Amino acid sequence: KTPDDVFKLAKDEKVEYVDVRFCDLPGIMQHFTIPASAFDKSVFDDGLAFDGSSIRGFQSIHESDMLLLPDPETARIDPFRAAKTLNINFFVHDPFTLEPYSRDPRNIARKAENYLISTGIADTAYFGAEAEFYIFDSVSFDSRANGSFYEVDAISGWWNTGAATEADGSPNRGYKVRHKGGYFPVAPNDQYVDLRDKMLTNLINSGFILEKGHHEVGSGGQAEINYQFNSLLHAADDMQLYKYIIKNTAWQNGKTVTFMPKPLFGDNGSGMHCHQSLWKDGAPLMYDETGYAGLSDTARHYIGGLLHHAPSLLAFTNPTVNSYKRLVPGYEAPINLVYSQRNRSACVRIPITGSNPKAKRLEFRSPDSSGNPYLAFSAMLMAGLDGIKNKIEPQAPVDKDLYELPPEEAASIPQTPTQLSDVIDRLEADHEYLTEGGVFTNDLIETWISFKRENEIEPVNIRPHPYEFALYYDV
Amino acid sequence: KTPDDVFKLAKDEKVEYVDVRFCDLPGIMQHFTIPASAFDKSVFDDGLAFDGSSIRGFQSIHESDMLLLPDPETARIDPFRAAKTLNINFFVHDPFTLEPYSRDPRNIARKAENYLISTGIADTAYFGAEAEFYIFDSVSFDSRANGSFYEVDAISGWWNTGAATEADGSPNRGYKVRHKGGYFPVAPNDQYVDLRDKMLTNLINSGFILEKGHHEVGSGGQAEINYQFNSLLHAADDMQLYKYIIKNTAWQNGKTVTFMPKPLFGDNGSGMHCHQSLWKDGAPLMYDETGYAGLSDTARHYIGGLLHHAPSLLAFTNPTVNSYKRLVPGYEAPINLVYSQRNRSACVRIPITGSNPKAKRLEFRSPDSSGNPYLAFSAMLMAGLDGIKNKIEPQAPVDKDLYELPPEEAASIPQTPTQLSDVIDRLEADHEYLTEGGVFTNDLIETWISFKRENEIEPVNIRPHPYEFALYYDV
Amino acid sequence: LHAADDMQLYKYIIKNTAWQNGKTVTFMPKPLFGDNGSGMHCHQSLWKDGAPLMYDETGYAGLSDTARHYIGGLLHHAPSLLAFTNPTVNSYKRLVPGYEAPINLVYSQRNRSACVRIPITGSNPKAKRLEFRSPDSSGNPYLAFSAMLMAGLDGIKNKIEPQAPVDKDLYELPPEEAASIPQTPTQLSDVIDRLEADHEYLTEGGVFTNDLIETWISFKRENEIEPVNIRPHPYEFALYYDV
Amino acid sequence: KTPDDVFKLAKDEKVEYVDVRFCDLPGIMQHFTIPASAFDKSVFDDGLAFDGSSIRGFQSIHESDMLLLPDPETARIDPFRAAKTLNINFFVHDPFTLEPYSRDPRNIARKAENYLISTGIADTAYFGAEAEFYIFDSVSFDSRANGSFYEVDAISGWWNTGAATEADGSPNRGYKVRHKGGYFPVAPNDQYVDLRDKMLTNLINSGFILEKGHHEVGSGGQAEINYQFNSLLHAADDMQLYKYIIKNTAWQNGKTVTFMPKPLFGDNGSGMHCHQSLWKDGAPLMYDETGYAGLSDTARHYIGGLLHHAPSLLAFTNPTVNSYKRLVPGYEAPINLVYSQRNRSACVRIPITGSNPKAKRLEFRSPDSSGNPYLAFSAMLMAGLDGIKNKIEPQAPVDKDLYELPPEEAASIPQTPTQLSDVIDRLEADHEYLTEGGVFTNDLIETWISFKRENEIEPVNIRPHPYEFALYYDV
Numbered sequence A, B, D: 001k002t003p004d005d006v007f008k009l010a011k012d013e014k015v016e017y018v019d020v021r022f023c024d025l026p027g028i029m030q031h032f033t034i035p036a037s038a039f040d041k042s043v044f045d046d047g048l049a050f051d052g053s054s055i056r057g058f059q060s061i062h063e064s065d066m067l068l069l070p071d072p073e074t075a076r077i078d079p080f081r082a083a084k085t086l087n088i089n090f091f092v093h094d095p096f097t098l099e100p101y102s103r104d105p106r107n108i109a110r111k112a113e114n115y116l117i118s119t120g121i122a123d124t125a126y127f128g129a130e131a132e133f134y135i136f137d138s139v140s141f142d143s144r145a146n147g148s149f150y151e152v153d154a155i156s157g158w159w160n161t162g163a164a165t166e167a168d169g170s171p172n173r174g175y176k177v178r179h180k181g182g183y184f185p186v187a188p189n190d191q192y193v194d195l196r197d198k199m200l201t202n203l204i205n206s207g208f209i210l211e212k213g214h215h216e217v218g219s220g221g222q223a224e225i226n227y228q229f230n231s232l233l234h235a236a237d238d239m240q241l242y243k244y245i246i247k248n249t250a251w252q253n254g255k256t257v258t259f260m261p262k263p264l265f266g267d268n269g270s271g272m273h274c275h276q277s278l279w280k281d282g283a284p285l286m287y288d289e290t291g292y293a294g295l296s297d298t299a300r301h302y303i304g305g306l307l308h309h310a311p312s313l314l315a316f317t318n319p320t321v322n323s324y325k326r327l328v329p330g331y332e333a334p335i336n337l338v339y340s341q342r343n344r345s346a347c348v349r350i351p352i353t354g355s356n357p358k359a360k361r362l363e364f365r366s367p368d369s370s371g372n373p374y375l376a377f378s379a380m381l382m383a384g385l386d387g388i389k390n391k392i393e394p395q396a397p398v399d400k401d402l403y404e405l406p407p408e409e410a411a412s413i414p415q416t417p418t419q420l421s422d423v424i425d426r427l428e429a430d431h432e433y434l435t436e437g438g439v440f441t442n443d444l445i446e447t448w449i450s451f452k453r454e455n456e457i458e459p460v461n462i463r464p465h466p467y468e469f470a471l472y473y474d475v
Numbered sequence C: 001l002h003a004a005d006d007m008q009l010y011k012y013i014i015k016n017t018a019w020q021n022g023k024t025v026t027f028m029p030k031p032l033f034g035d036n037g038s039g040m041h042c043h044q045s046l047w048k049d050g051a052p053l054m055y056d057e058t059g060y061a062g063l064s065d066t067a068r069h070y071i072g073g074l075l076h077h078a079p080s081l082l083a084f085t086n087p088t089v090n091s092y093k094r095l096v097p098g099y100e101a102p103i104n105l106v107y108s109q110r111n112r113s114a115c116v117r118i119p120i121t122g123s124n125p126k127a128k129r130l131e132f133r134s135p136d137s138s139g140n141p142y143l144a145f146s147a148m149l150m151a152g153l154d155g156i157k158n159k160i161e162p163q164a165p166v167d168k169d170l171y172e173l174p175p176e177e178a179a180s181i182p183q184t185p186t187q188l189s190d191v192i193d194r195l196e197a198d199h200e201y202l203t204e205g206g207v208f209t210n211d212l213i214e215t216w217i218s219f220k221r222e223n224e225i226e227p228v229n230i231r232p233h234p235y236e237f238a239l240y241y242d243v
């Protein structure tokens, strides 16, 4: 796509407004709107200014001014706004030198793709991401000196089977979803068919190649919609747009969506499994008919890299305090650093695909959607490429239900990290694999560590947990 | 039809989505949705994957991946979804060997039909099933440390005659249905005429050949809709689709349906009577002018098999704890293992159909809708064939009201099983007739027994019943 | 007899002290799901001429042959004996693992997971006795106490040897070991059927008569077992509404 | 006191009941009641039996029976029960050997005192403990699949200045306590003067030698009542009786008390500072006019032991998840491991006492009362004694506000542990100083570690925090 392709699209669509978008460091898209009449060549030539102070992980107040330059390949019409709007993603640049910004997530993805080519290992990294989510009806929460609470609610939640009426006073008609029982009964047990169809249609209309949509395991409206894999930067751009469409399709239809890893205690969390393959000259590299699970040496060393760097890598792939509430046994999320074919209890699963080399890939099951896909996908690639470069051999595959291992035997396998502060500490101590080729820089890494400690870890740590009152009020 | 016929139907209808459906072991249909764009030759050639470990009766987590292959004969347009959708049922297959799955209910029905042909006895088994249901307004329930309740409700329920207002605050207008008095006065006493017309219409539009529709005996909106019999596998697919259309027609019209065997205490339960006949070379085998109730030796021995194998057979035909609350006297459901013409108190009724050989069949009144029609129909056939093959003679017919015979006479007649655990116990100890020709396998039967004990029998067993507090609080 | 009279007086006093003070008491075996039930453990000893018969320093748990054979009788007749000691439908909600009530038919010292526990009492013969942990107070103390005695007396008369004591947490045994031990009965209808088929040890000396045993069976079937069997359980709605 | 002295007390007081008491492992006192008629010489000779499997940290179900033998020194008349009652503490014993139980906390304290004598260092360790607490009006909390909350409330809590009425509907009259402003304004700002007087009186009548009573720093009714120090075991029995008297005086007067370390977020937590001193032959050992803060080598090496062993010692002195919410800066609790005279921000303060050698002691400010005082005082002693035996020199005192230290200076001092899992891990790795002389045994330490992991650390870790919803719902 060219600047001229974008102007033509805006004209043909009778666009009233253009929405200017970019990513903050933690992973939330940011925006301002310009009139169509202000969308000209100058936007591409000179760019547009914003306040870098007000964006998390960006600039200080005395060095606030920053610049944005358009990415023509990201232009998509908005499905929700009454006034016809075209959305476009931008790269962040220095306002003096016009150089790409070191803490622009989209720049990191850019640099990662270029570094890959520079290695001669491959020219394309493909990412297929499964971002699960919950379709709720309501959420409320607070934090005070003498009390704190949260509650999420959903009509299909099993906690409501005993309700006398629904929230709007209408009768309880049953057909609510049992815990761990949402994957995937037909309607009327599935109460979200029509809404997911709206989501599917909005995605098709915005340029997604769709594969499938379904209710997920969790009670209270867990869902998943799958779309075709793409190369790293494109994939991460797709992910951000996907979350926007899912959240706003829900919002326009009276619902509220969360992508948080573990909103429900005692039911499945929400992961972001990443299917990954490396290709060169249009041909796949992950396949060897003689390998365990049909994997080549290249594929096996990529896995070796992921599982070796995991203790620090999870700082980018599982970046929140809530992340580590999902990494607990019995819910199809990982609890140790094992790879295994067909195995949804493992950290890396190899899906059963047959002899087709183009279908061969690994599934990294650890990641969730609580962070930044540009950083997550890039960190995973840097880990895998360190594995290949150093020929890191992964530990032998364990083809077992990993949650049913007796404690003496469970202890003999490297475990997933317990909490966020551990992965941040470990990232601080060893991150050289990430700074290879300048893909990540020290200033980015130091900012990330500093933001997570001051804004997430410490605020949670200092606040009494409601279960501490259950355990200790009467001590 | 054929694959190409399905592609033409999808094209002619301008289908937006395709719903991929299969059956879990207990008997609930499962689904996910693909776009019309993703419905191609590839789906037929190499199939679609899913999580076998999330499906009841299927796989463990470390062997989770399973495969689905389409059945063209089952393609139907969905009458409920705003986005035009084509529903198709699939067979479950191993993802390595591509062979049919030993615990796919639809495969069991396949195997049953092919076993029949191999015996030489017949080439076609016809099943006409009468699946009764209740049209309720609401339901709620729960189970706690210190309490437990359930309540179902319906405008037409006799328990509501003294209500000052209806649920929405409108006036009580009377015309409610007396207990055991629903079969079948005209409107306004019949409050569901228009709704049952919609159900009939939706079924007609889904390729059903309809016979009749009516209010049934039970107060609170019991109902029955009858459609033309078909061969075993088609009949079981028809049953599953009929449940879907009934439940969702009701849901779209502000109501809620249950197929559970005994939702009301002191009024009729809901059965699934199965009219059964064997045919060979296009000619019926059940008729003989000289026999009792016009039955041939073949038909009599089939009945012999049903009544002889009933103590283990009811594990598939009456597969839930709630099943055995229906098998009590006074409600046109069986209490002992007897056959009789014209007799609605019997286990096997022979309906009065005259001299036409084509109309001659047996009605097995024992079964209910609480399980798996694929497994239940197959098991009934396997029992009947062991009866023919071994010439099992049924005990003398008893042409009396079976609920009202003297206690001394009732003692010579074998009674129906008292509870689920007894039929599961009996199935474990003696299931050879089911494993004939490999139709049922030991892994299926072991899985069934295991599931019922762990997820149904024990869970009910450990929970105090409300009537225990009526009997024992003051001991 | 004095003990059974004491029990009925105890229950009357507990119930009405509660009632006069704004409360309400229940002696039912399992009013709460997921928490401990209410048992009626019966510590039992036989005496002659003011001197105890249960003690022998050389026996397992300091028990005499007479005591060991009494235990033998209790564990052997239990499939029918429970018709009088655990006489209600609710009784059998208590007989589940994890709550210090028995689930299999063994004896063991110091063991609160066993059917019969021998409490640690030392060398005093006046203190040596068995604790039958199976019984609850949902029935009749006069009939429960008498039936336990008749079972123990048959054990002594026929020198019934109990199976070897299992000094382990009986809820936590591996499958192969757990299945080799006779289990407690699952439900009331099972013990009533068994009482009907085999009650000779109770009608010895005419202590229990056929008319009492027939009335008991007829009462439990008509007024308890069948009324509960025919009524849908709330949890059937949790499991089956959407079938 | 002898057996006969207690029998005489029970007689003279015309006692109706005797309450048999002992300590569980975590720190809660247990009890059952016997009639005065059953309190006889057999109780002293034979003891009394209980179920060791229902007490936490004690026996398994198959080895349940345990024995109790009385301690005549601990006999006091109960101030609350209408039926005149004498309370007596017991020691736990093996029912076969009659030996003391290895996991009886009261036995541990007894072993500690005997070990002290055997060293020659001293013959008496005196403990003066300051157990702060909150006098609340109410508390509620829960933990569900879809939500979790807690709330404490008190009339004097600053969060209530804006209330239209009080809980009972009467007018808001002001004079509520500002956060951090409760130490210690006159009434009516102090709303608990009369209640604290009732507490003081009850304590006086139970044989406590009282020093003072006051409102503490926290809003919402924080309080402290100080009594005369005593030798290790006596001091620990005193602490347990003190907690019982405080809680039940509040209860009988319409209130509810908590000793939990940090019930309020952003106000002072509740500590249990322990003033400590060693004496030999009736003479003090802590004093030397020439030492810093008038401390002797014995005293300095005792402090050196406490600060060196703290990383594992806090497993007994700060034994809960909630403990580590208190160990944050700005609330007069320690954040690092230094000693300093006059310094309420330090880990060990030396109170200003002057020239009197009997008044000379250390204050260990780290501990709270969320656990077991028998274990905590014993663990403190063993750390101190290891310090004296090995002449461990503490790092130079830092006589500054330790919360306000410059980044370089702060980082040069060892911080207190962040969380319970860290101190439990460290106790497991290094606990030889505790097992000296068999005072603590391996079985005790192993059981403690096991209890805390399975019943406290893990249960909190798996439950989502409400603030995670504040941070992450919209990711």
Ligand SMILES: Nc1ncnc2c1ncn2[C@@H]1O[C@H](COP(=O)(O)OP(=O)(O)O)[C@@H](O)[C@H]1O
Residues within 6 Å of the ligand: A126, A127, A128, A129, A130, A211, A226, A227, A228, A229, A273, A275, A276, A277, A351, A358, A359, A360, A361, A363, B049
């Ligand atoms: N060779 C490949 N490399 C990377 N991703 C792939 C490849 N083949 C397929 N994918 C992607 O993997 C994802 C699989 O998602 P899904 O079907 O939900 O898998 P799962 O079996 O884990 O549920 C899809 O996004 C798909 O486009």
Ligand SMILES: Nc1ncnc2c1ncn2[C@@H]1O[C@H](COP(=O)(O)OP(=O)(O)O)[C@@H](O)[C@H]1O
Residues within 6 Å of the ligand: B126, B127, B128, B129, B130, B211, B226, B227, B228, B229, B273, B275, B276, B277, B351, B358, B359, B360, B361, B363
């Ligand atoms: N020869 C036959 N073999 C099997 N099923 C048959 C045969 N003839 C009719 N049926 C089916 O039996 C069912 C009868 O249902 P229904 O009219 O409700 O009977 P009932 O008299 O038991 O109420 C229908 O589904 C019908 O198509």
Ligand SMILES: Nc1ncnc2c1ncn2[C@@H]1O[C@H](COP(=O)(O)OP(=O)(O)O)[C@@H](O)[C@H]1O
Residues within 6 Å of the ligand: D126, D127, D128, D129, D130, D211, D226, D227, D228, D229, D273, D275, D276, D277, D351, D358, D359, D360, D361, D363
């Ligand atoms: N020599 C000593 N050794 C141990 N404890 C002592 C000694 N002298 C006094 N104490 C005790 O120390 C405690 C001091 O408590 P408090 O007056 O609240 O002190 P502060 O608030 O200044 O820390 C009292 O219990 C007191 O009896």
Ligand SMILES: C[S@](=O)(CC[C@H](N)C(=O)O)=NP(=O)(O)O
Residues within 6 Å of the ligand: A130, A132, A183, A217, A224, A268, A269, A270, A271, A272, A273, A326, A331, A332, A333, A344, A365, B050, B051, B054
């Ligand atoms: C059914 S599941 O295994 C569930 C994944 C889980 N929600 C997780 O937290 O990773 N997902 P998929 O089959 O789509 O890979």
Ligand SMILES: C[S@](=O)(CC[C@H](N)C(=O)O)=NP(=O)(O)O
Residues within 6 Å of the ligand: B130, B132, B183, B217, B224, B268, B269, B270, B271, B272, B273, B326, B331, B332, B333, B344, B365
């Ligand atoms: C009127 S009935 O006998 C009622 C049967 C009852 N509902 C049962 O089988 O539980 N049905 P049908 O006449 O359709 O055979």
Ligand SMILES: C[S@](=O)(CC[C@H](N)C(=O)O)=NP(=O)(O)O
Residues within 6 Å of the ligand: C036, C037, C038, C039, C040, C041, C094, C099, C100, C101, C112, C133, D050, D051, D054
């Ligand atoms: C503490 S317990 O073991 C509990 C017994 C349980 N309530 C039961 O159902 O038997 N009772 P006891 O120690 O009084 O014999």
Ligand SMILES: C[S@](=O)(CC[C@H](N)C(=O)O)=NP(=O)(O)O
Residues within 6 Å of the ligand: D130, D132, D183, D217, D224, D268, D269, D270, D271, D272, D273, D326, D331, D332, D333, D344, D365
């Ligand atoms: C006023 S304070 O310093 C407050 C101590 C604080 N509550 C703590 O958590 O240690 N106590 P004290 O003066 O009684 O030693």
Ligand SMILES: [Cl-]
Residues within 6 Å of the ligand: A321, A419, A420, A421, A422, A457
């Ligand atoms: Cl953390």
Ligand SMILES: [Cl-]
Residues within 6 Å of the ligand: B321, B419, B420, B421, B422, B457
């Ligand atoms: Cl059952």
Ligand SMILES: [Cl-]
Residues within 6 Å of the ligand: C089, C187, C188, C189, C190, C225
């Ligand atoms: Cl029963």
Ligand SMILES: [Cl-]
Residues within 6 Å of the ligand: D321, D419, D420, D421, D422, D457
């Ligand atoms: Cl912790």
Ligand SMILES: [Mg+2]
Residues within 6 Å of the ligand: A130, A224, A226
């Ligand atoms: Mg998926």
Ligand SMILES: [Mg+2]
Residues within 6 Å of the ligand: A130, A132, A216, A224
């Ligand atoms: Mg998924």
Ligand SMILES: [Mg+2]
Residues within 6 Å of the ligand: A130, A273, A363
């Ligand atoms: Mg996946």
Ligand SMILES: [Mg+2]
Residues within 6 Å of the ligand: B130, B224, B226
């Ligand atoms: Mg019919």
Ligand SMILES: [Mg+2]
Residues within 6 Å of the ligand: B130, B132, B216, B224
């Ligand atoms: Mg009918």
